[PDB]
Amino acid sequence: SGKPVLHYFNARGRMECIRFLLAAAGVEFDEKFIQSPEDLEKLKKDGNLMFDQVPMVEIDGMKLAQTRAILNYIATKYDLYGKDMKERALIDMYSEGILDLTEMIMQLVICPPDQKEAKTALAKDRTKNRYLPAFEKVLKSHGQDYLVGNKLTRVDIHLLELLLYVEEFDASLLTSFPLLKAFKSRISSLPNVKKFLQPGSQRKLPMDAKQIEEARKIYKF
Amino acid sequence: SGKPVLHYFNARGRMECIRFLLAAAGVEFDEKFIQSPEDLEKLKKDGNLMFDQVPMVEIDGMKLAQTRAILNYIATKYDLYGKDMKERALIDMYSEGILDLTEMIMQLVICPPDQKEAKTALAKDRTKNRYLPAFEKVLKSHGQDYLVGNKLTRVDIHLLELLLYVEEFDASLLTSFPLLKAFKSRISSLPNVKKFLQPGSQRKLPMDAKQIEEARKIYKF
Ligand SMILES: N[C@@H](CCC(=O)N[C@@H](CS(=O)(=O)O)C(=O)NCC(=O)O)C(=O)O
Numbered sequence: 001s002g003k004p005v006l007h008y009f010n011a012r013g014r015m016e017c018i019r020f021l022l023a024a025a026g027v028e029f030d031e032k033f034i035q036s037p038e039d040l041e042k043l044k045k046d047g048n049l050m051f052d053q054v055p056m057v058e059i060d061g062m063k064l065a066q067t068r069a070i071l072n073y074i075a076t077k078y079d080l081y082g083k084d085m086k087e088r089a090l091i092d093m094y095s096e097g098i099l100d101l102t103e104m105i106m107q108l109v110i111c112p113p114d115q116k117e118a119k120t121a122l123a124k125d126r127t128k129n130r131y132l133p134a135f136e137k138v139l140k141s142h143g144q145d146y147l148v149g150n151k152l153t154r155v156d157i158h159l160l161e162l163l164l165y166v167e168e169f170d171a172s173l174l175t176s177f178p179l180l181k182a183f184k185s186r187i188s189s190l191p192n193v194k195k196f197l198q199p200g201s202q203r204k205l206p207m208d209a210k211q212i213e214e215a216r217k218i219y220k221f
Numbered sequence: 222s223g224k225p226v227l228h229y230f231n232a233r234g235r236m237e238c239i240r241f242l243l244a245a246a247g248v249e250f251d252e253k254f255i256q257s258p259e260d261l262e263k264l265k266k267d268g269n270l271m272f273d274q275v276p277m278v279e280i281d282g283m284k285l286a287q288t289r290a291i292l293n294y295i296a297t298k299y300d301l302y303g304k305d306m307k308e309r310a311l312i313d314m315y316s317e318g319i320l321d322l323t324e325m326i327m328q329l330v331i332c333p334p335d336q337k338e339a340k341t342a343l344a345k346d347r348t349k350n351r352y353l354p355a356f357e358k359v360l361k362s363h364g365q366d367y368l369v370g371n372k373l374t375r376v377d378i379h380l381l382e383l384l385l386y387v388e389e390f391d392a393s394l395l396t397s398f399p400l401l402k403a404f405k406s407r408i409s410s411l412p413n414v415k416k417f418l419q420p421g422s423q424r425k426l427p428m429d430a431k432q433i434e435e436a437r438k439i440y441k442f
């Protein structure tokens with residue numbers, strides 16, 4: 001088989017979505033966590049990071065970097081990418097929106113303190129007035145269990161991850177989205193997913209004051 | 222046939238890559254430029270923007286938003302997406318790097334003036350020490366005319382666009398990349414491309430002081 005190797009920080013960051021997808025597909029993976037700048041420098045010095053950056057995943061003889069490129073490969077490989085062109089268009093559109101909101105939430109735990117209140121307010125507004133209504137719309141338009149093609153695809157996993165982050169952010173934001181709540185529960189019950197959600201998995205925890213200061217300098221000046 | 226409708230600002234922004242790809246595929250398109258905030262508000266109020274944002278392209282009965290989702294659909298549809306999974310992995314990896322550098326360059330014409338010198342310096346360093354060497358590497362590894370699969374794909378177009386932007390930024394940065402220069406000339410000579418590069422096409426010009434202040438407020442508060 002050959003167990004994929006994921007190179008990234010001991011953190012969610014951009015690698016988390018990939019971890020989720022792989023776990024969802026029931027594919028066991030090995031991780032090589034960069035603990036120090038020296039490690040990152042070693043990685044780069046090894047010439048396997050196309051743009052001297054991570055995520056980077058070794059799979060099928062390739063040293064694939066670029067989050068989306070990685071997700072994209074895994075999705076097709078395990079058949080979590082729908083059944084055709086139009087389905088993929090929807091999948092892509094939904095996924096991109098998910099990523100955007102994700103980053104938006106991340107920014108919150110990074111923005112210059114004196115400006116937090118406002119940013120939080122915007123992220124919440126956007127969350128409940130722009131994003132959630134959209135996914136709820138999709139779910140409502142067809143009444144089916146999956147977002148696209150009435151079959152499990154990567155976006156279902158992507159949507160789940162985001163909802164979990166929204167729940168950590170502020171759980172009251174999800175209470176006016178019944179279909180999304182039901183969806184969340186459904187996807188969370190999928191064996192592979194349930195397992196990933198269980199403790200002792202490679203699922204990373206949210207960034208903390210100590211494991212945050214390091215990554216700033218470690219970035220590699 | 223049905224000519225695709227592209228909704229965006231009378232500017233490059235995120236829509237430019239899509240314009241390039243379509244032109245490259247020889248697909249004529251119609252554009253609906255948002256000139257004022259009222260126009261943007263009308264667009265949103267019309268309920269055809271999934272996340273109340275543009276790019277948004279009407280094609281094949283879909284109101285497809287999200288740059289990458291759009292590019293992705295067009296690439297597969299016109300066969301500018303390679304021949305398989307591994308090819309697509311390379312295509313994706315390369316494309317993402319191209320986008321990153323692109324944004325980096327954009328930021329330059331947006332960053333708070335007092336900080337420009339430094340940012341410019343970083344972008345130049347990255348351009349010549351991280352990005353160009355990478356593409357030059359690819360070209361060097363196989364000696365072929367195209368980046369991937371020895372056949373025209375979306376990345377070739379993507380690479381061209383970026384090189385043109387690099388040339389506008391600082392043309393001396395490309396002189397130490399012979400294969401890239403030869404590549405640039407080659408892709409620019411492709412009929413559809415040559416046409417797009419010719420005046421009177423839908424190719425947008427670089428943002429200017431007047432057509433920049435508007436887009437800030439127009440963003441839609
Ligand atoms: N577009 C890339 C972005 C990767 C990226 O930004 N990598 C950063 C770290 S992080 O932002 O993801 O945390 C990096 O390795 N930078 C190191 C360097 O530039 O020296 C992707 O999505 O894969």
Ligand SMILES: N[C@@H](CCC(=O)N[C@@H](CS(=O)(=O)O)C(=O)NCC(=O)O)C(=O)O
Nearest residue numbers: 100234235273274275276287288440441
């Ligand atoms: N991830 C989206 C980003 C789209 C986006 O940011 N759209 C902005 C304008 S721009 O940044 O591309 O210029 C927008 O329409 N914002 C309007 C609003 O949010 O009200 C994509 O790539 O399609």
